[PDB]
């Protein structure tokens, strides 16, 4: 199976209430393994998975210095961006950064990325070739030309094609029992009366890992997203995921409606109609 | 492992 390692950074300014809130989180696939929160006790990068606690004291020291260096860039960035957009000091603003890398089932590098947002929309991102930047607006053209002059892409490419894939590989084998598992979805089927004219068929999927799942509704081979209420995939809280899809059916004609579940833990994509 | 060289916007 393919794998990824991703880091997520959110920084939010606090006018008149001091230093920005800084939160960093690291994932391997859909398993969070590290966090730092500027508001927590320790002021250290903290373990969030059993298999990462077997790293030594130098790992945690190092991560703590590097996350605190991210904390700094983000903080100065909030002031810098305020300047670029000429915004007042009385407002709260958000920066978010996401970077990481994908590997294939051979565990070789597939893709690397580094995205950056201001106020919840795209500011600047490293393009697919890891050599160039896409600036969103005129103010981000400044950051881009600054990052071209400072050779930022080169250092990122070296991380994303090298260190990122090297450490992902290490994590995947350190947490083999947790990371390289695939949990098959346990599927249900429920039916409830809206009235005496309408009936809701709801297709369930529980206890799956990884989170990537497709639930689709269909009548006689032709797919039906004209009625498909589809909820967002939600964490169960034990490291597995849940999701459901509903359609509103003319009751009595529930024969020719089929729910299709596809997941990587399924040997064959499941087909299901109401019992 | 985090990236070691972050740079200001």
């Amino acid at each position, epitope marked *: 199976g393919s794998h990824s390692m991703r880091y997520f950074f959110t920084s939010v300014s606090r006018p008149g209430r001091g230093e920005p809130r800084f939160i960093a989180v690291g994932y391997v696939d859909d398993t969070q393994f590290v966090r730092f929160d500027s508001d927590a006790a320790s002021q250290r990068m903290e373990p969030r998975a059993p298999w990462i606690e077997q790293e030594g004291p*130098e790992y945690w020291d190092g991560e703590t210095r590097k996350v605190k260096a991210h904390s700094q860039t983000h903080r100065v960035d909030l002031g810098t961006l305020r300047g670029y957009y000429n915004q007042s000091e009385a407002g709260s603003h958000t920066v978010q950064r996401m970077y990481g890398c994908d590997v294939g089932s051979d565990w070789r590098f597939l893709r690397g990325y580094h995205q950056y947002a201001y106020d919840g929309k795209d500011y600047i991102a490293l393009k697919e070739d890891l050599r160039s930047w896409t600036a969103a607006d005129m103010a981000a053209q400044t950051t881009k030309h600054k990052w071209e002059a400072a050779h930022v892409a080169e250092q990122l490419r070296a*991380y994303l094609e090298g260190t990122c894939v090297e450490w992902l590989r290490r994590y995947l084998e350190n947490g083999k029992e947790t990371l390289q598992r695939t949990d098959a979805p346990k599927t249900h089927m429920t039916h409830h009366a809206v009235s005496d004219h309408e009936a809701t068929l709801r297709c369930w999927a529980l206890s799956f890992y990884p989170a990537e799942i497709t639930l689709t509704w269909q009548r006689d081979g032709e797919d039906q997203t004209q009625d498909t209420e589809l909820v967002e995939t939600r964490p169960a809280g034990d490291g597995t995921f849940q999701k459901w899809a509903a359609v509103v059916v003319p009751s009595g004609q529930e024969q020719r409606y089929t729910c299709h579940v596809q997941h990587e833990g399924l040997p064959k994509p499941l087909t299901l109609r109401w019992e | 492992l985090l990236f070691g*060289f972050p740079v200001y916007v």
Partner: T-cell receptor
Amino acid sequence: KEVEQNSGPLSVPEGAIASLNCTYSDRGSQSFFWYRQYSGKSPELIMSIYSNGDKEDGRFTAQLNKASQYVSLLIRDSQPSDSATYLCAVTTDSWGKLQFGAGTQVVVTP
Amino acid sequence: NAGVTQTPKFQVLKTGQSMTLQCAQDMNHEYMSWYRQDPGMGLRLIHYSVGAGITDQGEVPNGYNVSRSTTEDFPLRLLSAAPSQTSVYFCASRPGLAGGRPEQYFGPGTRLTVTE
């Protein structure tokens, strides 16, 4: 010793290859350097390498093997002006101490 | 861009004299360092600084102090010279979060000899 460098002195005639090795101990090191320091002078950066594999720049070739934690420098076609102490330097990040090896002195003989 | 300048190149101090070594940098680097170099010891970090106005000790701070009033300038003070301070002191600078390729560049050095 975070960084371990060979010997000294390394005697090589002109035209020959001087191969310098170094070992580091922090697994999370991301940046790798070679400095040249002439006697009575200051260390001068000659090679920087950031990914596994080779990097050529004139007569200099720097190799990096992160899996064995090994940095190397090849000096081909040695000139008498290559006679100096060569220091490898290793870091983890922009706030991490640059970790220097002790140096290996290279003597180029006529 | 001069890069890392440093003065004096040479200095005889007499035990118990104060002196300051100057160091200046052209590159808007955040991260400046002081070292000494000694025959059996290699390069040894004395004090360092990752921004203007802030500093911290290295492995060998004792008998030295340091300030960073501006980003450009990083003077080292020896407040009372001892004969173990005879050494070759090097200022250095890397970008920190400010900049480019993460390369550290060194001043030309200062050869200080302390005698009784």
